[PDB]
Design a protein around this ligand. Structure first.
Ligand SMILES: O=[N+]([O-])c1ccc(O)c(O)c1
Ligand SMILES: [Fe+3]
Length: 851
């Protein structure tokens, strides 16, 4: 009929616009400028000669051995000044492809960059030729120089395909890229590479600096099982072949590292700079005298948010002009590092000391995930051939009968009004070693009572120490009781500090690090290795992985390494990451589902009468009531989406990419748990629904709930101390007499010191921030990720459900009957509101673990 020209438009982004090193002059307004319409300021000429070639690949027409026909390699040929839909930072180019009827419909293209500098390819649009709409290619990928790659970068069109549905001329192109994504499991990984594979955590220590810097390998053994992380390829340590050598640069596959248009959104780079630059320069102010080394009063802790802390020019003038830190540090002139007032004291400076708030934060605070309903009394331990495990807690029936309600202990258990916060088992086998450092800690249990007003009240705290004389005859325990006058109340405040210290560390290593960051990483690796970019399930999961391998690789470098911030700041110290591996021994994938978690802790009973199929034992449990709505929204979306693609349970059993993905996930990625009976088989569509809903819940809402309340609750070190360094003052002594005369100073010398307070605050302020270009749950994706209009509609229904839920959650915050939502601290629980603007907001649910 006619040999035609297909009109293409390519959208790309120049490195300079996305790169941290060059973007460090622009960070206050972005989205704006003449939405960098590329054209103006001609670097764009450099793209226009024999610089960049594209080569179209037919989806319908095949050569002799069955692969889609290649068109002619075509170079970029003109700059497009403006498009209705051109965004900030983006540059557009026209290219015309010679094609004909006989070559059919394009379904992929190859691209070669002949420039020395990489660029970020955004999209290709083809404006076609037969009775056929536009073809869209969503790329989002860095394109490095063509002679670095053995085969050309390939990109597929918009169309979602199951493996049995991919156009025959494209079958080999699909499997070849999947093979290229796997690598062969050898070699040192390079910056430009997009190779996904697994390794154990043999990465965190530095045995070449000494024996005291070595850390156990986590994963691949029964003592310390762990999920895998991204394989990097470095040479082993000289002292230990089983440990990988340290580097200042950690590889991750190239498109897992996201750039930003704005200086202030480069938050990993801020974290990195705190460890590298701010910590040594702070640590030189305590190493002589410009700062008093200890806090002497509570007033001096509050000074941090008013006038802040005096530092000399010397240090201040080196820390004021770094890149990203310009936002998260406030500086008066010379002598001030200030901190923003944490939401916990904005209404009342003293309401955190209240028993009601202490209890409330177990349901609505940073770690709202651990509380259990007491089923039998006294509470038991799950520890072994020691005794206090086959024995019990030393909290007694007569310890618990006081003022409010007047029931027996059995009556309160029967009516489900007793609750437990149990921090006894994880720290106990390490307690003896921990207490030989500067740290002094206890293993704690707290029993809480549900009052008639719907609030919780702490009733008893058990402080346990390892061994009067050896691990044989169990816990040495004392129990403490609430009081509100005299020395007794100062003692009770300290008793609560020893609980929170356990809870902060468990929150950081397990609720946050293990259960979100570490556990999610092998799913990203499995997904990229085995599911084509074209697969429906790849498209469902992909936004929930954004930037995760990036923050995790930075954590291995600076957060969770030997001598890094977690070891210096938190209670478990040098045993921190190991102890999280011990706890991973009890991790079950299917108990991460929110209703399964709730039932397992006895916080809910199953009930078809009730909105989400369960009945709560505490109705005003803000994490759980709000989380249930978001869980249900997630589950309904995943179900609608899955059941659009899979015609039967058989179609899922026949899908080789999905089957291989899940098999490698179980056998390798979470490979220390490969023989556990609770892993879903992927033999049924409802099992794919459940697993995908658990992954998405984990990456989005669970991580938000546990992450973005850290500065607002714990930016006052007094409310969430991270370590203790003194035992309880004994009844007739000099420390007891100090507790009588100056209990503030006594509290202050028990908790985290001033130096590590300053580190902790600096880190959790960055961690509690949303970047400007955060992509939130729901409505938000990158752009038009599929051409399946049934999926687009179903995704719009999801976003609509979430905006409906946002309103319902906000109206709950205005309900005067629900007082665990606010507390005496007058802090409305907004952590599970899906949207947010940027900054230290105490809300917003990102798609992924992004910080
Ligand atoms: O709990 N952790 O180890 C952390 C703390 C902060 C992070 O940014 C992170 O990736 C991990
Ligand atoms: Fe995080």
């Amino acid at each position: 009929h006619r040999g035609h020209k297909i009109k293409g438009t390519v959208v790309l982004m120049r490195k300079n616009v996305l790169d941290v090193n060059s973007v460090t002059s622009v960070g206050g307004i972005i989205g704006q400028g003449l939405d960098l319409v590329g054209s103006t300021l001609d670097t764009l000429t450099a793209f226009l000669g024999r610089s960049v070639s594209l080569q179209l690949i037919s989806a319908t027409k095949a050569d002799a051995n069955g692969k889609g026909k290649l068109g002619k390699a075509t170079f970029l040929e003109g700059i497009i000044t403006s498009l209705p839909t051109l965004g900030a930072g983006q540059s557009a180019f026209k290219i015309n492809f010679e094609w004909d009827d006989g070559s059919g419909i394009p379904g992929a293209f190859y691209i070669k960059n002949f420039m020395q500098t990489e660029f970020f390819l955004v999209s290709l649009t083809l404006e076609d030729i037969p009775n056929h709409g536009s073809i869209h290619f969503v790329c989002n990928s860095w394109i490095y120089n063509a002679k670095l790659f053995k085969s050309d970068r390939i990109f597929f069109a918009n169309q979602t395909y199951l493996p049995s549905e991919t156009p025959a001329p494209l079958v080999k192109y699909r499997e070849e890229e999947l093979h290229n994504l796997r690598g062969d499991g050898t070699g040192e990984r390079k910056e430009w590479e997009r190779i996904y594979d697994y390794d154990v955590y043999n990465d965190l220590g530095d045995p070449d600096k000494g024996e005291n810097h070595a850390r156990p390998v986590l994963g691949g053994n029964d003592t310390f099982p762990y999920p895998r992380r991204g394989r990097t390829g470095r040479k082993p340590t000289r002292k230990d072949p089983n440990s990988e050598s340290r580097s200042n640069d950690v590889y991750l596959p190239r498109d897992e590292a996201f750039g930003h248009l704005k200086s202030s959104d480069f938050l990993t780079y801020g974290l990195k700079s705190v460890s590298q630059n701010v910590l040594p320069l702070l640590q030189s102010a305590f190493d002589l005298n410009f700062t008093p080394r200890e806090f002497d009063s509570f007033d001096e802790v509050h000074g941090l948010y008013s006038g802040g802390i005096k530092l000399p020019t010397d240090i201040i003038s080196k820390i004021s002009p770094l890149p990203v830190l310009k936002e998260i540090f406030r500086t008066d002139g010379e002598q001030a590092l200030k901190f923003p007032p944490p939401k916990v004291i904005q209404v009342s400076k003293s309401a955190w000391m209240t028993d009601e708030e202490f209890a409330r934060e177990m349901l609505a605070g940073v770690n709202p995930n651990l509380i259990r309903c007491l089923k039998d009394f006294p509470p038991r331990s799950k520890l072994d051939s020691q005794v206090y495990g086959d024995h019990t807690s030393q909290i007694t029936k007569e310890h618990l009968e006081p003022n409010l309600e007047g029931l027996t202990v059995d009556e309160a258990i029967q009516n489900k009004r007793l609750f437990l916060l149990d921090h006894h088992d994880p720290i106990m086998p390490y307690l003896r070693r921990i207490n030989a450092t500067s740290t002094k800690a206890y293993a704690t249990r707290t029993i809480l009572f549900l009052k008639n007003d719907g609030t919780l009240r702490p009733l008893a705290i058990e402080l346990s120490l390892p061994h009067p004389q050896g691990d044989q005859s169990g816990a040495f325990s004392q129990v403490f009781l609430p009081a509100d006058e005299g020395v007794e109340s100062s003692i009770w405040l300290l008793a609560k500090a020893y609980v929170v210290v356990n809870d902060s560390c468990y929150h950081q290593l397990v609720s946050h690090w293990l259960n979100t960051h570490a556990v999610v990483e092998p799913f990203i690796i499995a997904t990229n290795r085995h599911l084509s970019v074209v697969h429906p399930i790849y498209k469902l999961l992909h936004p929930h992985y954004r930037d995760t391998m990036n923050i995790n690789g930075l954590a291995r470098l600076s957060l969770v390494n030997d001598g890094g911030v977690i070891e210096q700041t938190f209670l478990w110290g040098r045993y921190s990451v190991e102890m999280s591996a011990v706890v991973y021994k009890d991790w079950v994938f299917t108990d991460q589902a929110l209703p399964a978690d709730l039932i397992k802790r006895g916080m809910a009973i199953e009930d078809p009468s009730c909105p989400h199929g369960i009945r709560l034992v505490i109705e005003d449990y803000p994490y759980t009531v709000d989380g249930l709505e978001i869980w249900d929204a997630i589950k309904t979306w995943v179900h609608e989406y899955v059941f659009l693609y899979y015609k039967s349970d058989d179609t899922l059993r026949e899908d080789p990419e999905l089957q291989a993905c899940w098999k490698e996930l179980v056998e390798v990625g979470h490979g220390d748990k490969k023989n556990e009976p609770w892993w879903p088989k992927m033999q049924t569509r409802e099992e794919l629904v459940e697993a995908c809903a658990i992954i998405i819940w984990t990456a989005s809402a669970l991580h938000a709930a546990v992450n973005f309340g850290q500065y607002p609750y714990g930016g006052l070190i007094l409310n969430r101390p991270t370590l203790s360094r003194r035992f309880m003052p004994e009844k007739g002594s000099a420390e007891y007499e100090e507790l009588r005369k100056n209990p503030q100073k006594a509290y202050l010398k028990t908790i985290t010191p001033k130096f590590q307070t300053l580190i902790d605050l600096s880190v959790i302020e960055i961690l509690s921030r949303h970047a400007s270009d955060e992509v939130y749950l729901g409505e938000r994706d990158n752009p038009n990720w599929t051409s399946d209009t049934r999926a687009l509609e179903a995704f719009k229904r999801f976003g609509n459900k979430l905006a409906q839920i946002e309103n319902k959650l906000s109206e709950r915050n205005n309900d005067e009957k629900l007082r665990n939502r606010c507390g005496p601290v007058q802090m409305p629980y907004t952590l599970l509101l899906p949207s947010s603007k940027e900054g230290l907001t105490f809300r917003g649910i990102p798609n992924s673990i992004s910080i």
